[PDB]
């Protein structure tokens with residue numbers, strides 16, 4: 001059965017998809033993401049699919065033009081978190097540990113700037129908790145080297161300007177404050193702005209066409225078509241889009257007894273907005289009938305590691321069982337691990353078996369201007385299409401689904 005897939009997976013087709021999409025970054029809600037949506041829609045149509053485009057709005061964020069952070073007089077290096085409000089405050093700096101509801105409680109922060117350490121709770125909770133006590137601004141310092149780049153999740157007027165700084169420059173301030181030093185700081189954020197944008201999900205569905213063998217099962221194969229600012233996103237995630245499109249083309253040449261939904265989600269980098277919006281469109285019957293959701297994200301980099309399957313809870317499910325079965329016949333042992341950070345999380349949330357297929361550890365070009373076409377491996381793209389396609393086909397081919405018992409290890 002695998003041969004029906006493996007003899008049809010065209011690596012050149014996938015390479016070409018990536019070439020077209022990665023000519024420029026595809027920031028969610030931008031003209032470039034719209035261009036990708038149109039392109040993807042047209043390719044699905046070319047394979048004979050009826051296509052639907054689901055629109056949705058979300059709050060976008062334009063990084064601030066001026067990020068000035070100063071400790072008394074010396075100018076420091078800091079980066080405002082996404083969705084950070086604007087500010088022009090100069091006041092005493094107060095250390096509030098991790099910034100929990102208790103840490104900031106027993107401390108006078110009214111009109112002051114809070115110094116918080118990165119820990120477990122979200123950057124959003126810290127800013128929010130500090131702002132609740134009167135803090136006019138928040139300075140968060142990293143736990144490791146390198147600049148601290150984070151996001152407050154989404155817009156929220158309850159926030160106050162928030163900027164991040166490296167661990168070294170943070171432990172120093174915290175130490176002096178604990179030592180009893182009275183420090184004054186300056187936090188000025190200008191340029192930041194939030195506006196409503198529209199993104200889209202592209203859905204191509206192949207209804208079962210066997211006949212008496214048709215089941216009422218549904219399988220979703222997805223990827224996301226947006227990329228981060230300044231990143232051409234060849235591997236993240238044009239690669240996933242490419243495999244999604246090619247597998248749709250491959251399946252159009254075969255009879256199936258399972259409904260297949262090939263989807264490219266928008267605004268994945270903004271917090272899985274697209275997939276959340278699509279998941280929310282499903283009926284209770286559709287949810288119970290979806291036997292598995294396969295997410296393809298970063299599956300073609302010559303500089304990435306081996307293929308692995310990630311689940312939200314780090315447990316095996318129907319999708320990892322199918323992935324492992326296919327791989328066992330085609331390439332060898334395919335491990336699984338625990339990780340979210342992609343659209344499969346939106347389906348796992350509904351109780352639908354889901355897994356992310358990705359090459360880990362990821363390449364160093366991840367989310368950089370270096371995530372380009374010349375880093376792509378046709379051989380790897382073809383391998384992923386072969387494995388994911390055969391895993392899906394094990395279920396979609398006419399006849400009852402049978403998954404033989406096979407062992408595969410969990411790997412972190």
Ligand SMILES: [Zn+2]
Nearest residue numbers: 006009382386
């Ligand atoms: Zn192959």
Ligand SMILES: [Zn+2]
Nearest residue numbers: 006009010382
């Ligand atoms: Zn092939």
Ligand SMILES: [Zn+2]
Nearest residue numbers: 055198199200
């Ligand atoms: Zn639209």
Ligand SMILES: [Zn+2]
Nearest residue numbers: 236237297298
């Ligand atoms: Zn991605």
Ligand SMILES: [Zn+2]
Nearest residue numbers: 228236269367
């Ligand atoms: Zn990404």
Ligand SMILES: [Zn+2]
Nearest residue numbers: 377378379380
């Ligand atoms: Zn080779």
